[PDB]
Amino acid sequence: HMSTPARRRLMRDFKRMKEDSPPGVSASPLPDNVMIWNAMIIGPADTPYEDGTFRLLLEFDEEYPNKPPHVKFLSEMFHPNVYANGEICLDILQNRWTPTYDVASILTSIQSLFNDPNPASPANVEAATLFQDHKSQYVKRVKETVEKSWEDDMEDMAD
Amino acid sequence: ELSDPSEPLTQKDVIAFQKEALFRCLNKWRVKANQLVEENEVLAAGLSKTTESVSGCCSSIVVLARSVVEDCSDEQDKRFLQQLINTEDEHTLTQIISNNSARICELILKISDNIGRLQELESLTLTLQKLLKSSENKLKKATEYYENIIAQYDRQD
Amino acid sequence: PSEPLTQKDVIAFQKEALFRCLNKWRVKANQLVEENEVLAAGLSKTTESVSGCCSSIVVLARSVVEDCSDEQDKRFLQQLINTEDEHTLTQIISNNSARICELILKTSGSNISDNIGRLQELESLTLTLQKLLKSSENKLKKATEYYENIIAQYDRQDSESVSRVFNT
């Protein structure tokens, strides 16, 4: 049912996604559980993650938008700010949250991590040390995850 | 075979983005593999053509070594000149001559620090000029390879 | 066909076939870079060792030019001593190999090199050439990325999927 202030807003976010979905972004709450979202970011151009089909999983809380959601990459990843299980070390998801952030705002903020990773939090120590000194080998390794992302048939995006 | 832009994407629209992307990645690898076989043959050709050219020097050095063993005095050097003369595998001989070139030139003639410096400088002067020529050649032939594919795109219909 | 040739032609191909084709080229490219790296390594290791022998003939030529008498032979040693093209130098040595040994032994005694300027001239040239080789190889390294970028961006510019997802 959809009377809870949190659930009420999550449907408000969903409407925006259905009408002004950011470029290279997909997001759909589970048809029954409106607290778990399937998401999919496409790596922007002129970034080593270019043309990747990276799947995300957004888990929300009853306090939203006052509390950030849990965000996990589902596709395999190689990013300085992505832990080995998919959990993203993003600022707006940790200590710089805000109720003016809907789903789109969070998926584009994760999208922007592709072009410029935050060097402050090395979740992936290898990815961080590659991106800072050996950039040519960095792009070589990022593209191997871009290739893997294509394997999934995007069944999570059907109706 | 796609859908409307100002709309959320579809399972069909992303499968079509993956296939078109899989091809572009396929093509990027295909062009990288073809450029390398052209360089690999020119490398394997030039690698054989360089080993063939040493036989002029090696044969001329062995005869010059044999000419002086009868008048050579130091037995560790006499044994060394013999070791040089009696090596049949030419790969061994070329390094034995390259690695011990300073010892060789002195033993044939019978200042010494000048020889070590002119041999170090001449070998490097020769090595670098050839290495630069092949690098400039690898650069010249590679630019031609890619611009062939570029021209087929700049006019394709 | 086994492998598709155009971006238009891939809509009919299933994904499992496109992946099988991509890997065959990706794996062929990795074997070829290893082959290209190890080959270019062995080509430099051989040019240093061929120059080892070649230089020893040049050094013996420089040592005996002062006591050679007939100038048609001195011109031959001079032509030999001052060339830096190994194909040129190796032909000169292969074609006249016995003559060289004759001129080396014909000289009565070992005679001292008279010019340190050629060693400084080579020292400066040695440094200039090392600088030119690195810059030439760098011109090639950045170009491989540069040309592969423009070729790939032509496929992107003509793509229907890319223009749908990102173009505003």
Numbering used by the authors:
A (entry chain A): 0 to 158
B (entry chain C): 12 to 121, 127 to 173
C (entry chain D): 16 to 183
Paper text:
We screened through several fungal species and were able to crystallize the Kluyveromyces lactis Rad6 (KlRad6) in complex with the Kluyveromyces lactis Bre1 (KlBre1) N-terminal fragment 1-206 or 1-184 (crystal forms 1 and 2, respectively). The structures were refined to resolutions of 3.2 and 3.05 Å. The complexes in both crystal forms adopt similar conformations, except for complex 1 in crystal form 2. The orientation of KlRad6 in this complex is related to the orientation of KlRad6 in other complexes by a rotation of 14°. KlRad6 in this complex forms extensive interactions with neighboring protein molecules in the crystal, which may play a role in stabilizing the observed structure. In contrast, KlRad6 molecules in the other three complexes do not mediate extensive crystal packing interactions. When the three KlRad6 molecules not mediating extensive crystal packing interactions in our structures are compared, large structural differences are observed for residues 90–98 and 115–121 surrounding KlRad6’s active site. The 90–98 region can be resolved in the electron density map in crystal form 1 but is mostly disordered in KlRad6 molecule 2 in crystal form 2, the equivalent Cα atoms in the 115–121 region are located as far as 5.2 Å apart. In contrast, in KlRad6 molecule 1 in crystal form 2, the temperature factors for these regions are not elevated, consistent with stabilization of their structure by the extensive crystal packing interactions.
